[PDB]
Design a protein. Structure first.
Ligand SMILES: [Mg+2]
Ligand SMILES: [Mg+2]
Ligand SMILES: [Mg+2]
Ligand SMILES: [Mg+2]
Ligand SMILES: [Mg+2]
Ligand SMILES: [Mg+2]
Ligand SMILES: [Mg+2]
Ligand SMILES: [Mg+2]
Ligand SMILES: [Mg+2]
Ligand SMILES: [Mg+2]
Ligand SMILES: [Mg+2]
Ligand SMILES: [Mg+2]
Ligand SMILES: [Mg+2]
Ligand SMILES: [Mg+2]
Ligand SMILES: [Mg+2]
Ligand SMILES: [Mg+2]
Ligand SMILES: [Mg+2]
Ligand SMILES: [Mg+2]
Ligand SMILES: [Mg+2]
Ligand SMILES: [Mg+2]
Ligand SMILES: [Mg+2]
Ligand SMILES: [Mg+2]
Ligand SMILES: [Mg+2]
Ligand SMILES: [Mg+2]
Ligand SMILES: [Mg+2]
Ligand SMILES: [Mg+2]
Ligand SMILES: [Mg+2]
Ligand SMILES: [Mg+2]
Ligand SMILES: [Mg+2]
Ligand SMILES: [Mg+2]
Ligand SMILES: [Mg+2]
Ligand SMILES: [Mg+2]
Ligand SMILES: [Mg+2]
Ligand SMILES: [Mg+2]
Ligand SMILES: [Mg+2]
Ligand SMILES: [Mg+2]
Ligand SMILES: [Mg+2]
Ligand SMILES: [Mg+2]
Ligand SMILES: [Mg+2]
Ligand SMILES: [Mg+2]
Ligand SMILES: [Mg+2]
Ligand SMILES: [Mg+2]
Ligand SMILES: [Mg+2]
Ligand SMILES: [Mg+2]
Ligand SMILES: [Mg+2]
Ligand SMILES: [Mg+2]
Ligand SMILES: [Mg+2]
Ligand SMILES: [Mg+2]
Ligand SMILES: [Mg+2]
Ligand SMILES: [Mg+2]
Ligand SMILES: [Mg+2]
Ligand SMILES: [Mg+2]
Ligand SMILES: [Mg+2]
Ligand SMILES: [Mg+2]
Ligand SMILES: [Mg+2]
Ligand SMILES: [Mg+2]
Ligand SMILES: [Mg+2]
Lengths: 131, 228, 88, 180
RNA sequence: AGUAACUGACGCUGAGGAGCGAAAGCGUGGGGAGCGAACAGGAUUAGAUACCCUGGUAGUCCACGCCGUAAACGGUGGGUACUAGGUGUGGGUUUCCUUCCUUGGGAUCCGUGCCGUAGCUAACGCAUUAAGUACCCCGCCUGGGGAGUACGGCCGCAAGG
RNA sequence: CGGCCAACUACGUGCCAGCAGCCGCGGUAAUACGUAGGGUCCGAGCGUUGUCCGGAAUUACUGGGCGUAAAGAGCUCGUAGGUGGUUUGUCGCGUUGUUCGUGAAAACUCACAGCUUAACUGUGGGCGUGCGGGCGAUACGGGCAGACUAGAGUACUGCAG
């Protein structure tokens, strides 16, 4: 059954990237919303905005494409999942794409990016690797 | 910028497509709507793409580029041959030899052979050979002249390739991408858009639209030729 | 299968209100009436395995609903089980 | 000046009603040593024709390696053919650590420091295909930042910025020495 | 399938456990036209304890119990979300050329055939009813014989599993 | 000193006498057997033998598959366990948020220094990857303290099998 909204969101986004789609509609949640927020802040996605549906709120994400049509997203994968939950200390922050990617880490402040998280010295569970 | 007007295009029926049984879903963002199971091409993006094609062709002709004309359907053979022989530009209209542009060192020898045969025939020596081989050589003249029209005049290999009805003419565009030569072609409702670098929306199945598009591109080539 | 007359009688008579129908009380009431009636039928008809499948499915469904009632409120669970006179 | 190497020679055979017909196939890798890679697979009945075909095919098929100064930019997991070849850069002077076919193709590429491992199907052809795909998978920081629409300092680490600046200074010094 | 009145985290998969289950086989008591292991003859072959012909005993049928194995195959566990189409079939709601007859045209959900993109796969091939891209749990595999066998344990009256 | 694996020719017996870690080598003319030279490797050590890890992603958490190579149990119901569809509220028991507080000695890693340099040890750091209590946080990842419904179920009408 529907058992992992974050993985479902990541897979729908990367499936849309593979299928060259432009707009994706998903059920809205705080985790999805702020993950889209950090995606917008890093610039891998174009833009996001929330909407209203027949029942509850829904969020739409517009993919990013350039003049030469190559994908703006290379690949996504989740490391922390129900069951195998992986966590990182203050010194063992994961390195993704040789530091050219982004790991999403939930710290005491919130879902924040790995570089500034290491700058603060804070750490936590890694959501997914986006590169 | 454009030369052909909207009423002229509608009269020529350049907006039409095929039936619902042949269109590939890669034309969804080009198709506007469907009536009576027939798909229509989108005019404004058609104009943007033909404008981009005009810019590219004027650029390449101004810089001295060679563009080969490709078209084999029975309707457009006469039109392409006529316009190409008036503009003085190499063309292929009847038979596409596999990899003649890619494998050019092989067909260069037979261009040499055909020129030598023309030189020998123009001398007037026919009774010096047996009538059997005379008939054989006349037949091979017919065959090679009929199947080879453009390499007589191109020699120095092209810079761009222009194709009509790519789904049947996949060989030419495939060789073009394999060699890296830029591709300009007409994409119908059943054609792959990534195959053509500079697509030109239109119909390969209507002689009005085909003739008008060929005349427009020939006018662009003539303008560049005067502009050198 | 229950029909309109007795089924509306049951839904009203064990209903919390005169309009609610999907309440767990009415759901358990319908399941129990169905199981006793068709178990009486299967006491005569022995080898109806396709219907014993329905028995087992409806019974597991019932068990899930009773577990939900016990979880949400002990008092309502006890009242329901006492008013229907079952064991669990 | 091009670098030439041979990885494997095989005596392939064909059968007819008469008997056995032998044939020869060869695979070679060509490179300039600066980051330009070409692979060739050639078949013949004799080694000279085979190597000539391989060299011609390699000259036809080229590919460019975007290396940072002397090493690779980021680790790459090249999953292609039937083998898994995993490439990542290392500290300068560590050396190009790789198998046979990977060794040849990387040395023709001209890289000097790499860590590699082949995880299955040690066949040379599949290994070469996997390494070529791994190099294709490589991404360069400048146009990565261009795609992301974010400037270099906000994308790439200060350490690799320092390494790139040092590499650029060394290249400028070498160009000045060559000109003088 | 439609209205969506109501419940308001009740959902999923599920080690051990329990129930169903092709044909054949077994007990008891009946039935038994046709068919047909076993077994007799006739025929071929150097040879037939087979293929072929003539017969026909269990069984094949019924009721109650049993055994619980099949290339038990889609050789693919279930559930959920997403990802281009074309061509048939079945079931139901709607709307519009409207005769309002019409596989007329359109919208919608479920089931079931065929061909095909991108993608995956070593290949054949799969391709929204995925082997595509993922999430949750469960069983199974770690070179071929020995061997799915000996011993031990459990079930079965036994064959046996 | 056949290919793996840097190192070849002659002489002597030919399915014999023999080699050998995998493929594998002698059936009168062997770079694979024995002898000679010649060269290669190593060196006061040289090989054989046995145990252990790596390559073995060949037990795959990082990091494997189940169509045909090994594998989906015959299929369901379902107990214990594992996992949950939105947003409406505390304590902070899954958790990171900083600090003082342990981490015996020895060993490993960094720099220094002494035995003429060599093992050897001479001094001071550093290292000593875990765990104890006091002080400061609340985004995810649970119980607990209240409401709504996009999964699910019921309710009304029909439906084909
Ligand atoms: Mg009924
Ligand atoms: Mg893989
Ligand atoms: Mg392997
Ligand atoms: Mg190997
Ligand atoms: Mg209400
Ligand atoms: Mg269910
Ligand atoms: Mg379960
Ligand atoms: Mg369960
Ligand atoms: Mg169990
Ligand atoms: Mg079990
Ligand atoms: Mg039982
Ligand atoms: Mg039983
Ligand atoms: Mg039977
Ligand atoms: Mg039976
Ligand atoms: Mg018996
Ligand atoms: Mg019996
Ligand atoms: Mg009897
Ligand atoms: Mg009979
Ligand atoms: Mg018989
Ligand atoms: Mg008798
Ligand atoms: Mg007999
Ligand atoms: Mg079995
Ligand atoms: Mg079956
Ligand atoms: Mg199954
Ligand atoms: Mg599933
Ligand atoms: Mg459907
Ligand atoms: Mg493809
Ligand atoms: Mg492939
Ligand atoms: Mg398909
Ligand atoms: Mg599917
Ligand atoms: Mg698979
Ligand atoms: Mg045997
Ligand atoms: Mg076995
Ligand atoms: Mg035993
Ligand atoms: Mg040697
Ligand atoms: Mg050697
Ligand atoms: Mg000898
Ligand atoms: Mg020597
Ligand atoms: Mg070992
Ligand atoms: Mg994992
Ligand atoms: Mg494994
Ligand atoms: Mg198998
Ligand atoms: Mg199985
Ligand atoms: Mg089994
Ligand atoms: Mg529970
Ligand atoms: Mg605390
Ligand atoms: Mg503390
Ligand atoms: Mg401490
Ligand atoms: Mg100490
Ligand atoms: Mg060490
Ligand atoms: Mg000293
Ligand atoms: Mg020390
Ligand atoms: Mg350790
Ligand atoms: Mg819980
Ligand atoms: Mg309310
Ligand atoms: Mg509901
Ligand atoms: Mg019916």
């Amino acid at each position: 059954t529907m058992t992992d909204p974050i993985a479902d969101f990541l897979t729908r986004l990367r499936n849309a990237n593979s299928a060259y789609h432009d707009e994706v509609t998903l059920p809205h949640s705080k985790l999805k919303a702020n993950i889209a927020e950090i995606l917008k802040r890093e610039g891998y996605i174009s833009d996001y905005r929330t909407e209203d549906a027949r029942v509850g709120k829904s969020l739409v994400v517009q993919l990013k494409y350039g003049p030469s049509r190559e994908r703006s997203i290379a690949g996504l994968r989740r490391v922390s999942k129900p069951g195998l939950r992986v966590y990182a200390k203050s010194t063992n922050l994961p390195r993704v794409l040789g530091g050219l990617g982004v790991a999403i880490i939930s710290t005491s402040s919130g879902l924040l990016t790995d570089r500034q998280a290491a700058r603060q010295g804070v750490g936590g569970e890694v959501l997914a690797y986006v590169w | 910028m454009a030369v052909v007007t909207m009423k002229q295009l509608l009269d020529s029926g350049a907006h039409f497509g095929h039936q619902t049984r042949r269109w590939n879903p890669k034309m969804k963002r080009f198709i506007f709507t469907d009536r009576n199971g027939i798909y229509i091409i989108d005019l404004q993006q058609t104009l943007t793409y033909i404008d981009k094609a005009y810019e590219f062709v004027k650029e390449t002709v101004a810089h001295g580029g060679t563009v080969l004309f490709v078209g084999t359907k029975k309707q457009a053979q006469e039109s392409i041959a006529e316009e190409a022989t008036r503009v003085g530009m190499p063309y292929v209209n009847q038979r596409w030899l596999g990899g003649m542009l890619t494998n050019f060192s092989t067909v260069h020898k037979r261009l040499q052979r055909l020129k030598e045969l023309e030189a020998m025939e123009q001398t007037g020596g026919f009774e010096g050979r047996t009538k059997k081989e005379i008939l054989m050589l006349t037949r091979e003249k017919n065959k090679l002249e009929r199947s080879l029209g453009g390499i007589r005049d191109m020699q120095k290999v092209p810079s761009a390739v222009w194709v009509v009805d790519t789904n049947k003419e996949h060989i030419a565009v495939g060789e073009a991408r394999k060699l890296g030569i830029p591709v300009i072609a007409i994409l119908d409702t059943n054609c792959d858009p990534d195959v053509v670098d500079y697509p030109i929306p239109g119909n390969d199945d209507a002689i009005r639209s085909a003739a008008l598009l060929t005349k427009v591109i020939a006018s662009a080539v003539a303008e560049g030729l005067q502009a050198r | 299968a229950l029909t309109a007359e007795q089924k509306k009688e049951i839904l009203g008579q064990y209903g919390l209100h005169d309009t609610d129908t999907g309440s767990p009380e009415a759901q358990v009431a319908l399941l129990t009436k169905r199981i006793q009636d068709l178990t009486e039928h299967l006491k005569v008809h022995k080898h109806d395995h396709h219907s014993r499948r329905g028995l087992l499915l409806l019974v597991g469904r019932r068990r899930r609903l009773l577990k939900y009632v016990a979880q949400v409120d002990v008092a309502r669970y006890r009242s329901l089980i006492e008013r229907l006179g079952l064991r669990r | 000046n091009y670098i030439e190497r041979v990885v494997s020679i095989n005596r392939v055979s064909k059968v007819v009603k008469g008997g056995r017909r032998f044939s020869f196939t060869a695979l070679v890798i060509v490179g300039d040593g600066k980051g330009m890679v070409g692979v060739g697979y050639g078949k013949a009945k004799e080694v000279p024709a085979a190597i000539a075909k391989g060299v011609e095919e390699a000259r036809k098929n080229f590919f460019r390696v975007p290396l940072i100064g002397s090493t690779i930019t980021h680790p790459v997991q090249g999953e292609a053919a039937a083998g898994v070849v995993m490439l990542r850069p290392a500290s300068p002077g560590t050396g190009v650590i790789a198998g046979g076919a990977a060794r040849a193709v990387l040395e023709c590429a001209g890289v000097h420091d790499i860590l590699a491992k082949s995880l299955g199907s040690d066949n040379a052809i599949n290994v070469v295909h996997a390494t070529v795909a791994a190099l294709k998978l490589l991404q360069r920081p400048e146009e990565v930042a261009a795609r992301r629409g974010l400037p270099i300092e906000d994308v790439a680490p200060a350490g690799m910025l320092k390494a790139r600046r040092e590499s650029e200074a060394l290249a400028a010094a070498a160009a000045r020495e060559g000109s003088a």
